[PDB]
């Protein structure tokens, strides 16, 4: 299925993923596309923060879904 | 491990904690450092208010995690 990622620039890119894909796998694809290391990526979907270890299906992520890429704050 | 506590205005203190620490212990540490009584402390993590009985590990609060302190009055 194809999903969308709202990148840091306001641009939306498309990814080919499977519901069985992990959040880490999506972050690796986002790293290939946008150059942000996975440990500095936060992915938000429909108000939910996506956790490493989970699959897209765990979050009801479907075709045409849009994830939002957030640069991981410095803490504080 | 070190975690961060940030007020609503963005001011930040740092705490030395353990994953096994309860939210009660964290509020007691905040009271020791800043003098704010635990009954007046509300702590937010991942959009939720944290309950005193659970531990930082129970909420998946890790090192470098940021908690948000709200004055309860």
């Amino acid at each position: 299925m194809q999903i969308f990622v709202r990148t840091l620039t306001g641009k939306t890119i498309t990814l080919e993923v499977e519901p069985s894909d992990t959040i880490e796998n999506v972050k690796a694809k986002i790293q290939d596309k946008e150059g942000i290391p996975p440990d500095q990526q936060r992915l938000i979907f429909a108000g939910k923060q996506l956790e490493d270890g989970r699959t897209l299906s765990d979050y009801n992520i479907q075709k045409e879904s849009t994830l939002h890429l957030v640069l991981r704050l410095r803490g504080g | 491990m070190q975690i961060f506590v940030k007020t609503l205005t963005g001011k930040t203190i740092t705490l030395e904690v353990e994953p096994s620490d309860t939210i009660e212990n964290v509020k007691a540490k905040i009271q020791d450092k800043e003098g704010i009584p635990p009954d007046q402390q509300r702590l937010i993590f991942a959009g939720k208010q944290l309950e005193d009985g659970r531990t930082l590990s129970d909420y998946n609060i890790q090192k470098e995690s940021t908690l948000h302190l709200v004055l309860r009055l």
Partner: peptide, 30 residues
């Protein structure tokens, strides 16, 4: 307190006490 609110930048569902997004620090829109 109110109900949770979606960040207008990343959609994260924030606590009603917070004035900025917990994830990206976008200020609350109301």
């Amino acid at each position: 307190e109110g109900a949770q609110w979606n960040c207008t930048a990343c959609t994260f569902l924030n606590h009603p006490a917070l004035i900025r997004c917990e994830q990206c620090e976008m200020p609350r829109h109301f």
